[PDB]
Amino acid sequence: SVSKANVPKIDVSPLFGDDQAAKMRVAQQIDAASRDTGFFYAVNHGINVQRLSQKTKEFHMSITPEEKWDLAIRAYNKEHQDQVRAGYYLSIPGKKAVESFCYLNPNFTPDHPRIQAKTPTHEVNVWPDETKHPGFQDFAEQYYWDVFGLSSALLKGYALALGKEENFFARHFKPDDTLASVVLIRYPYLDPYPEAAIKTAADGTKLSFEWHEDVSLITVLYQSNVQNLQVETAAGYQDIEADDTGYLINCGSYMAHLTNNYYKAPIERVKWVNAERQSLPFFVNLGYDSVIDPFDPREPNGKSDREPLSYGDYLQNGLVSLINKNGQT
Ligand SMILES: CC(C)[C@@H](NC(=O)[C@H](CS)NC(=O)CCC[C@H](N)C(=O)O)C(=O)O
Numbered sequence: 533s534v535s536k537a538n539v540p541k542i543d544v545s546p547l548f549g550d551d552q553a554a555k556m557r558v559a560q561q562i563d564a565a566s567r568d569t570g571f572f573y574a575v576n577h578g579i580n581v582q583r584l585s586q587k588t589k590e591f592h593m594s595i596t597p598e599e600k601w602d603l604a605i606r607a608y609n610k611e612h613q614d615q616v617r618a619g620y621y622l623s624i625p626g627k628k629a630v631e632s633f634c635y636l637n638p639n640f641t642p643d644h645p646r647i648q649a650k651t652p653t654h655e656v657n658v659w660p661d662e663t664k665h666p667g668f669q670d671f672a673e674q675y676y677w678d679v680f681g682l683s684s685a686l687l688k689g690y691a692l693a694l695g696k697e698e699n700f701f702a703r704h705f706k707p708d709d710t711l712a713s714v715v716l717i718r719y720p721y722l723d724p725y726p727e728a729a730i731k732t733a734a735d736g737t738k739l740s741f742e743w744h745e746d747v748s749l750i751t752v753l754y755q756s757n758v759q760n761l762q763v764e765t766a767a768g769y770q771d772i773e774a775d776d777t778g779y780l781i782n783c784g785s786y787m788a789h790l791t792n793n794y795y796k797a798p799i800e801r802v803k804w805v806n807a808e809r810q811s812l813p814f815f816v817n818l819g820y821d822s823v824i825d826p827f828d829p830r831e832p833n834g835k836s837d838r839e840p841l842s843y844g845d846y847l848q849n850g851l852v853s854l855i856n857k858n859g860q861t
């Protein structure tokens with residue numbers, strides 16, 4: 533038997549406004565979900581997710597094997613040593629079904645001082661030819677800023693939920709330095725579906741991606757309408773319902789660190805489903821040198837002995853460890 537996770541739908545629209553009491557009522561709902569299963573759906577978010585899905589499908593379904601090699605990250609193309617994060621993540625027919633395209637802050641250009649300094653985790657995005665993919669780069673860059681704006685509002689809700697002023701997290705989430713990423717993931721329908729691309733969990737469930745905590749402050753995720761995600765609870769994994777009209781939100785392990793685990797990073801995994809679908813996360817990452825002072829809302833004085841952790845170090849280590857543990861995607 534597999535039970536179903538409680539995933540409340542939260543109208544986040546007050547977080548864009550100036551009704552402070554309405555924002556507190558949003559924050560209470562975020563607090564409740566964050567202390568329960570860890571997930572909620574953000575509704576009335578203001579983003580056109582139909583267009584996001586349409587433009588993403590047009591890209592996934594028209595890009596050619598030649599273009600994938602040309603955009604491939606270093607794990608698939610030794611010529612591209614500077615591409616550890618941004619670029620194309622190839623499928624391997626017969627072995628690996630998933631493929632994806634990841635891009636970073638569009639403000640990371642050769643002029644940017646973090647690029648000049650060669651700081652880890654900063655890279656200049658790579659893009660297909662405009663004539664072969666008309667409008668794609670423009671769509672993808674505008675989406676980055678659209679979901680950045682939603683994420684900033686959500687971070688105001690999380691700050692208020694934890695008893696802080698609304699800019700406690702958002703003040704570190706800035707267009708000039710954010711390490712946030714978008715990933716456009718295609719999970720294909722395949723007939724036959726190669727068993728080599730299916731993992732078996734300890735509890736017997738067939739999986740496409742194994743258990744993990746997210747490497748993020750929060751994760752802001754759109755998926756098409758195919759149920760696949762599960763969250764771990766003490767009584768076992770529970771199914772998270774799909775909703776292709778909203779964004780599924782959860783905290784990452786940076787949030788758990790800084791709240792002394794008061795808002796835990798939920799453990800999630802991806803069930804194997806033989807269905808064509810999209811998984812489009814935005815990982816809300818701060819700047820390379822961002823440090824939030826840990827606290828513990830459970831204590832009257834909010835005191836935590838946890839050491840402040842620089843976001844860049846957290847991200848570099850977390851992305852490597854996730855590849856080591858759950859495979860190169
Ligand atoms: C569960 C979804 C969010 C999605 N999983 C994922 O995106 C998984 C687990 S959160 N995330 C990752 O592998 C980290 C990608 C980091 C990215 N290349 C970057 O440089 O910033 C999936 O559908 O598999």
Ligand SMILES: [Fe+3]
Nearest residue numbers: 744745746800
């Ligand atoms: Fe995850």
